């Protein structure tokens, strides 16, 4: 009558590119 | 015979102190009271324990069914001037009943 | 009775504990930790 | 071919110190 609760599932609406800027460790 | 009545406290002298910590017997713990009055020698000529001295003692065992009093003993006293003696005596109520 | 026999046998089962991944947990360091033998401080020169 | 006083047994026990040995990094 009960199961292990699943961990929070993230929503999939607010989609953004992760890299706003080129990362400096790319030597860029 | 007694050695020097001017520096000696016989058995059965009555020390009146006020309990500091609230007492709950659920666990074996430690107590504290401060004397409230000067305590003289049995000769009644020297103030041996300055009023306001600190007294530390303890208890153990909790109670048993129907029992109405817990038995505490006082370990060590301290006079504000630096005097420490090991008196081992049974804690009593206001009129001196055991416990 | 049959019910009593079944219950007396299968009553003592330890509860099972489930823990989600990614929870925060904390460690309370119980013993002094020394690092004198592995680390050293040098000043960064100015300019 | 070859050469050759301890009273308060309850309390004074519950106040037993518990020291843990420290460690050193490697």
What does this structure look like?
This is part of a larger assembly, with one copy of chain A (28 residues) and three copies of chain B. Helices cover 0% and strands 0% of the residues of chain A. The termini of chain A are far apart. By secondary structure, chain A is mostly loops. Chain B has one domain (1-99). In chain B, the strands form two sheets. In chain B, strands 1, 2, 5, 6, 7 and 8 form a six-stranded antiparallel sheet that branches. Chain B has a two-stranded antiparallel sheet with strand order 3-4. Helices cover 0% and strands 31% of the residues of chain B. Chain B is an all-beta fold. Chain B contains no helices and eight strands. The interface between C and D is small, with 10 and 7 residues. Strand 1 of chain C pairs parallel with strand 1 (23-24) of chain D. It is classed as membrane protein. The entry lists the keywords type IV secretion system type 4 secretion system T4SS OMCC Conformation-C core complex outer membrane complex R388 plasmid conjugation bacterial secretion secretion secretion system protein complex VirB10 VirB9 VirB7 TrwE TrwF TrwH, membrane protein.
Q: What general outline of chain A do the C-alpha atoms trace?
A: elongated
Distance between the termini of chain A: 56 Å
**Major sheet size, sense and barrel closure of chain A:** none
What portion of residues of chain B is helical? under 10%
- Helix content percent band of chain A: under 10%
Find the structural class of chain A using helix and strand composition: little secondary structure
Shape of chain B: elongated
- What amount of the residues of chain B lies in strands? 25-35%
Structural class of chain B: mainly beta
Report how far apart the termini of chain B are. Answer: 31 Å
Proportion in β-strands of chain A: under 5%
Helical run tally of chain B: 0
Q: In the residues of chain B, how many domains can be counted?
A: 1
User: How many strand units of chain B?
Assistant: 8
Multimeric state: part of a larger assembly
What is the total tally of β strands of chain A?
Answer: 0
